[PDB]
Write a protein that binds this ligand. Structure first.
Ligand SMILES: Nc1ncnc2c1ncn2[C@@H]1O[C@H](COP(=O)(O)OP(=O)(O)OP(=O)(O)O)[C@@H](O)[C@H]1O
Ligand SMILES: [Mg+2]
Length: 379
């Protein structure tokens, strides 16, 4: 037949994995990345998806779509939608109560339902899998946050159908993470697991109680507007200030300068999770001025201190609601690309009085990993 795949669809990135010969392989895309941006772009001549889309965002703000996960399954009159709209550089219109994204493709203006944008990303993932597997992918298990209602889940299932994917099942992201680590095996005991998920733009904390294979979400908390992007922003402002100090030039207005500076920062941030310092080299940032500088892990940590620290409040809240003390949680798994940050790992352990963190599986691949296993058994 055909190997069912596991797909995680995140607000900023997506990932696809497959279970074969007892091992789960996370499939790398055309650029060789193990995760693909959830970006879709429309130009005069083409429809760009993934890395190709994100790589040209500075040029096409109005026709480059993202955050479709924040729209999916919702209405236009939805307070959330009404708030989010204020920050997207693309158009969201009302179509009989449902929101739609309006872009210009090949001179003509077009509109898409949130699920159609997601189906585009889903198609890229399916494509990546097939290119690797050398076979056509039909069956799949897609992940969704635990707090998604039936409409949001419906729309995700739909986005899968559009892409020609037979969605075997939609499972929660935290549950997929648990399965990745094997925290679902029956041990004739009640296990309390805390899933700490800090991705690109969202922060989710979920306390699961696993009784004989059966998962039970006891509490959830977090911030839908706190993620790795907020950390990048802090770097940007910092460097803008420095440029204005060394050159007496404010580049805030120049959207190209800022958007290129941001890309440089996000990159330096990743290397800061291994090295203690990274350099920023950008040619002709503003006018013909080349911006050559660098940051240390120490400085980076200072810039996001309050943010990193504030991460513990949602954790305290989740425990409180679940009616558990720090000592009652058996396993803590790290999920989301942002958890690779050292200071975040330290901060969490200290809170759990030195308890060991589960983090051998790349945190941004954990959900995909778990869905792959789940997909495997489902076939
Ligand atoms: N080494 C690293 N250090 C810090 N952040 C990293 C590292 N590697 C990846 N990231 C960050 O992880 C984020 C992507 O996380 P992930 O791939 O889990 O996102 P996601 O599921 O789309 O997230 P969400 O749904 O929360 O937005 C980006 O902010 C990226 O900068
Ligand atoms: Mg994620």
């Amino acid at each position: 037949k055909g190997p069912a795949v596991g797909i995680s669809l995140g607000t900023t990135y997506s990932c696809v994995g497959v279970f074969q010969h007892g091992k789960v392989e996370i499939i790398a895309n055309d650029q060789g990345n193990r995760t693909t941006p959830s970006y879709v772009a429309f130009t005069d001549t083409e429809r760009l998806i993934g890395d190709a889309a994100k790589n040209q965002v500075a040029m096409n703000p109005t026709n480059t779509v993202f955050d479709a996960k924040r729209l999916i399954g919702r209405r236009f009159d939805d307070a959330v939608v009404q708030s989010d709209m204020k920050h997207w550089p693309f158009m969201v219109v009302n179509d009989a109560g449902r929101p739609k994204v309006q872009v210009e493709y090949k001179g003509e203006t077009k509109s898409f339902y949130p699920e159609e944008v997601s189906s585009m990303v889903l198609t890229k993932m399916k494509e990546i899998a097939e290119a690797y597997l050398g076979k056509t992918v039909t069956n799949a298990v897609v992940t969704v946050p635990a707090y998604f209602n039936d409409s949001q889940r419906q729309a995700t299932k739909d986005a899968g159908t559009i892409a020609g994917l037979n969605v075997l099942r939609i499972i929660n992201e935290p549950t997929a993470a648990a399965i990745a680590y094997g925290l679902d095996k029956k041990v004739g005991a009640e296990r309390n697991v805390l899933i700490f998920d800090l991705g690109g733009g969202t922060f989710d904390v979920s306390i699961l109680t696993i009784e004989d294979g059966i998962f039970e979400v006891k509490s959830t908390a977090g911030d839908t507007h706190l993620g790795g992007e907020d950390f990048d922003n802090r770097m940007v402002n910092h460097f803008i200030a420095e440029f204005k100090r060394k050159h007496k030039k404010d580049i805030s207005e120049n959207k190209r300068a800022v958007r290129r500076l941001r890309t440089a920062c996000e990159r330096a941030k990743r290397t800061l999770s291994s090295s203690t310092q990274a350099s920023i080299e950008i040619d002709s940032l503003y006018e013909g001025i080349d911006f050559y500088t660098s940051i240390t892990r120490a400085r980076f940590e200072e810039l996001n201190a309050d943010l990193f620290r504030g991460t513990l409040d949602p954790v305290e809240k989740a425990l409180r609601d679940a009616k558990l003390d720090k000592s009652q949680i058996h396993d803590i798994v790290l999920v989301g690309g942002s958890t690779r940050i050292p200071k975040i790992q330290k901060l969490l352990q200290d809170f759990f009085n030195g308890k060991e963190l589960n983090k051998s599986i790349n945190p941004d691949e954990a959900v995909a990993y778990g869905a792959a296993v789940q997909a495997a058994i489902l076939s």
